[PDB]
Structure 1
């Protein structure tokens, strides 16, 4: 989908219907570093594994 913003917070939705979600490492993939994309944005990418799993 696309990344959107309601003014303060950043979400990810599908392209044909509004349905925002929290940006994790299961909605995204990673390729490269932040000095070649024209228009990049600082945010936090949540991890769905570390805060629930310790033991």
Structure 2
């Protein structure tokens, strides 16, 4: 589950049945170094 596979819209307070997990950002390891 990455940012190029999913898209952001709204918040977790609207979707019925949303699970809490993590989404990997490919920009973070490139910018940390």
C-alpha distance in 1, partners of 2:30/2:6? 20
CA RMSD of aligned residues (A): 1.4
How many residues are aligned here? 33
TM-score by length of 1: 0.52
Q: CA deviation at 1:37?
A: 0.5
Structure 1 or 2: larger helix share? 2
Higher relative contact order (CA 8 A, sep 6+): 2
Q: Structure 1 runs of 4+ off > 2 angstroms?
A: 52-55
Structure 1 or 2: larger strand share? 1
- The aligned counterpart of 2:10 is 32
TM-score by length of 2: 0.79
Q: CA deviation at 1:52?
A: 2.7
